[PDB]
C-alpha cells in the first residue's frame, strides 16, 4: 500500500452544517457526484440526488462561504445521471437532461452566477423540448460530443443523433442500423425483453470517432463523418472462451477510458479483465488482457476508472497508469495498475489504504491521545472528531429511532 486515505469534509471547521448562502432554483444529492474543472481554475462539484430530481452545485475550494445551488427538476431523468450531461461551453455550465416523460431539458448556468453572491438568475436558464418520441423507443444513455452535437443511445440498441441548429432546438439525425436483422434468426426477437445489446460505455476519439462498448462486450466503432458502423470487435473471443458464464453487462457503467491512443476496457470474468489495445490510423489492435487481483470471491464493482500519464511510484519502470476505484457496499478500494513498457504484458498492481488513519485508530483502539473520562468529554471528543454535519445527522437518526439521552451521564447513549 503506497497510498493513504485523507478524508475531507469541507464544512468541518464550521459550526453550521450548511452554507448560509444556498439558493434553490426551480424548473417548470446522494446518488451521484463529481467534480469538473472550469476556465477559472476552480473546481465545481455537483451531485445528482437519489431520485434524480435534484442537481446540486458547489465550489470545491469555498464550500462554506461560497454558493451552493440546488436546481429542482419537474421529474426524474430517464435513466439517472446516465441521461445527464454537464459541460462548460462558453463561460457557462451547459447541462442537458433527458427526463422520464421524454422531454429534453437544457440548463444554462452562467459561470459568473456560480461564483456570485446573487440568489437570483436572469434570462432563459432552462429550455424544455420534445425532439423525439421516447415513449415508443426508450433511451438510457446520453453522450456529449460537441456544443451542438451529441448522440442518444437506446435500450433496444439503436442510436439517435441530436443536432443543434440555432441555439436551442435539437433534431434527430438517425444512424444506419442493420444490427436489428439478427431478429431473423431463431435466437433473437425484436419483441423480446432480452436480446438487446445496448451500449454500456462510450468515448469520443479525435472528435470524429465514437467508440462504444455493448452489453455483450462488443466494441463497435462509429465514424461520425460517415455516420456508419466502421468497426465491430468481439472483445471476448480473444481470451479463454468460457462457455460457462460471461456476464453480459446489465447496466451502464464506467467500463472503459482512453488516454492518447491507448484504450482499456473492463470485461467481466469473475469481474476481472482489463483488456487494453491501441487505436490507430480506424483500427483497434489488441495487446494483452490484464486480470485483476481481487479475492474474497471478487465482489467489487467498478465505480470509476481513469487511464492517464504515469505517477511518481516506487517503481521507475512505468509507461502508463490506470487508476481504478472499486466498491463493495459502502467500503471502497482504490488501486493503480502500473504498466511498465509499451508492451502491455509487464505490469504491477499497487494497492492503497482504504480507511483514513483517524478511522483505523478509532476501530483498532490505537488512539492514545484523545482525552478520556467524562461522558461530556466523550461528547466533545466525538463532536470535534466527526464534524457538525455528521454529528447532527447522527443525532437526527437517534431521535427518529426514539433513542433519547436519559441524563448527563447516560453511557448507554454515548455507546449508540
Amino acid at each position: 500500500a503506497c497510498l493513504s486515505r485523507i478524508d475531507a469534509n469541507l464544512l468541518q471547521y464550521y459550526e453550521k452544517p450548511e452554507p448560509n448562502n444556498t439558493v434553490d432554483l426551480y424548473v417548470s444529492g446522494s446518488e451521484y457526484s463529481n467534480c469538473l474543472l472550469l476556465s477559472n481554475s476552480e473546481y465545481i462539484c455537483y451531485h445528482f440526488s437519489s431520485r434524480s430530481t435534484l442537481l446540486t452545485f458547489y465550489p470545491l475550494s469555498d464550500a462554506y462561504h461560497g454558493k451552493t445551488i440546488n436546481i429542482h427538476l419537474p421529474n426524474a431523468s430517464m435513466n439517472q445521471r446516465y441521461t445527464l450531461t454537464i459541460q462548460e461551453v462558453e463561460q457557462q455550465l451547459l447541462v442537458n437532461v433527458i427526463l422520464k416523460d421524454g422531454s429534453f431539458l437544457t440548463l444554462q448556468l452562467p459561470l459568473s452566477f456560480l461564483f456570485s453572491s446573487a440568489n437570483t438568475l436572469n434570462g432563459e436558464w432552462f429550455h424544455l423540448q420534445n425532439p423525439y418520441d421516447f415513449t415508443v423507443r426508450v433511451p438510457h444513455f446520453l453522450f456529449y460530443v460537441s456544443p451542438q452535437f451529441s448522440v442518444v443511445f437506446l435500450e433496444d440498441g439503436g442510436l439517435l443523433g441530436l443536432k443543434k441548429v440555432d441555439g436551442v432546438h435539437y433534431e434527430p439525425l438517425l444512424f444506419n442500423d442493420n444490427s436489428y436483422l439478427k431478429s431473423l434468426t431463431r435466437f433473437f426477437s425484436r419483441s423480446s425483453k432480452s436480446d438487446y445489446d445496448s451500449v454500456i460505455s462510450c468515448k469520443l476519439f479525435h472528435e470524429r470517432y465514437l467508440i462504444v462498448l455493448t452489453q455483450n462486450c462488443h466494441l463497435k466503432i462509429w465514424d461520425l463523418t460517415s455516420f456508419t458502423l466502421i468497426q465491430d470487435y468481439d472483445m471476448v473471443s480473444q481470451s479463454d472462451s468460457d462457455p460457462s458464464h460471461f456476464r453480459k453487462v446489465e447496466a451502464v457503467g464506467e467500463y472503459l477510458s482512453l488516454y492518447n491512443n491507448t484504450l482499456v476496457t473492463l470485461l467481466p470474468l469473475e469481474n476481472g479483465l482489463f483488456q487494453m489495445g491501441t487505436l490507430l490510423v480506424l483500427t483497434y489492435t489488441f495487446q494483452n488482457n490484464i486480470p485483476t487481483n481481487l479475492s474474497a470471491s471478487a465482489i467489487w464493482s467498478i465505480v470509476d476508472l481513469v487511464l492517464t500519464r504515469p505517477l511518481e511510484l516506487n517503481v521507475e519502470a512505468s509507461y502508463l497508469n490506470l487508476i481504478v476505484l472499486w466498491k463493495s457496499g459502502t467500503a471502497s478500494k482504490l488501486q493503480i495498475l502500473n504498466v511498465n513498457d509499451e508492451s502491455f504484458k509487464n505490469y504491477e498492481w499497487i494497492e492503497s489504504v482504504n480507511k483514513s488513519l483517524v478511522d483505523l485508530q478509532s476501530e483498532h483502539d490505537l488512539d492514545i491521545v484523545t482525552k478520556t473520562g467524562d461522558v461530556e468529554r466523550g461528547f466533545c471528543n466525538l463532536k470535534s472528531r466527526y464534524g457538525t454535519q455528521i454529528f447532527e445527522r447522527a443525532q437526527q437518526i437517534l431521535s427518529e429511532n426514539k433513542i433519547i439521552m436519559a441524563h448527563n451521564e447516560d453511557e448507554e447513549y454515548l455507546a449508540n
Binding site: 483502539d365 490505537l366 488512539d367 492514545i368 491521545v369 484523545t370 482525552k371 478520556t372 473520562g373 467524562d374 461522558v375 468529554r377 466523550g378 461528547f379 466533545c380 471528543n381 466525538l382 472528531r385 441524563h407 448527563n408 451521564e409 453511557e411 448507554e412 454515548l414 455507546a415
Partner: protein, 343 residues
Amino acid sequence: SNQYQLPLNVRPYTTTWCSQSPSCSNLLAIGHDTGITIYCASEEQTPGSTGLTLQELFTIQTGLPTLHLSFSSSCSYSEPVYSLFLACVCQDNTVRLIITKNETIITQHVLGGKSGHHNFVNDIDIADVYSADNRLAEQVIASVGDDCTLIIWRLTDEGPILAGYPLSSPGISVQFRPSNPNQLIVGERNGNIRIFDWTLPWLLTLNTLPLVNTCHSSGIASSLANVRWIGSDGSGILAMCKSGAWLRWNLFGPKNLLPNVQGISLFPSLLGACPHPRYMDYFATAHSQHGLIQLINTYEKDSNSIPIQLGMPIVDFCWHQDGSHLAIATEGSVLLTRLMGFT
C-alpha cells in the same frame, strides 16, 4: 442510615477512614477549606440496624483547603491523647505531612514551589517503611500531578530524600502495594498504569484504553479515573474509567495474555472505585453528581446493586474497615450507612 452534620461553614473535599492503622481505624478525617476534622465511630446500643454511630472528636485548623487526605500506619492512641500523622494537599500546590497530638499541630513538613510539583497535584498516598531491626526507618509519601511528574518523598532518620520521575502524561492516582511497600502503582490520565519498585526500568505498564470491550463503545474520551490494588497481599489491580468502565487483573502462576475480567458501571465515576477491604470482588462507585452509589461485583454476582441513593451530590466516600458500613461526605455532611448483607 445515620447522618452527622459537618460545621455550617465547612465545605468537604475528601473523606477517608484510617484503615491503614488498626490502632486508629475508627478515626475519620474530613479535609475542608480550613483544615482536617477527626470523628470517632462507635458501636452504640442503637438498634442493630445501624449498630454504629459517629462521634465528632475535634477539628484540626490548617487555614487552607484540604483536597486529598491519607492516614499513615504511625497513628496511635493513648490515655486521652491521639498521636496522628496525615499526608495532604493544600491550596498553595504544596504536598504536606502534618504530625499532631489531637487538634494541635506539633509538627509540619512542606514540599512545594519548584522543588515540589510544577502544576496541580492530583493524588497522594503514604506508607511506613521499617528497617531489618524494625525501628521506624522511613515514612514514604508518593504523589502525582499535572506537571507530568511522580514524586517520591522519603523522610528518613538522617532526613528527607526527594526524588522526581517523569510521566508521559498527568498523574491522576497513586497507591503503594499492600503487604509490599517495595512496590507501588501510579495512574496516568491517558490510561497508562505503572507498577514501580522505588527501591531500585520500572517494572510494568498496563493500559485500559485499548482494552475497552467495545461491545458497547465506551466513547471518545474515557479518561482513567482510578487504579487501586485489591487483596491484603495486593494480589490484584483494578482500574476504572470516568466512563464507568472497569477492568481487573490478578498477580500470583502461568503465563498471562489479557486482563482477567472487565465490565462497566451503570454510571460515570468521577471519583473512581473504592474497593472493599474484605471482599476483593466488590467495589463501590458513585454517580457523584446525582448522588447515587452502585456496588459492583467483579464475577457478576452483582446484577446492578444500588444500595445508596441520596437526593444530593456526593463529594466523596469510603468503606469503614468492617466492610458493612460506609462513610460518605456530601457537600454539607457525612453519612454512616450500614448495608445489612455485609454484616
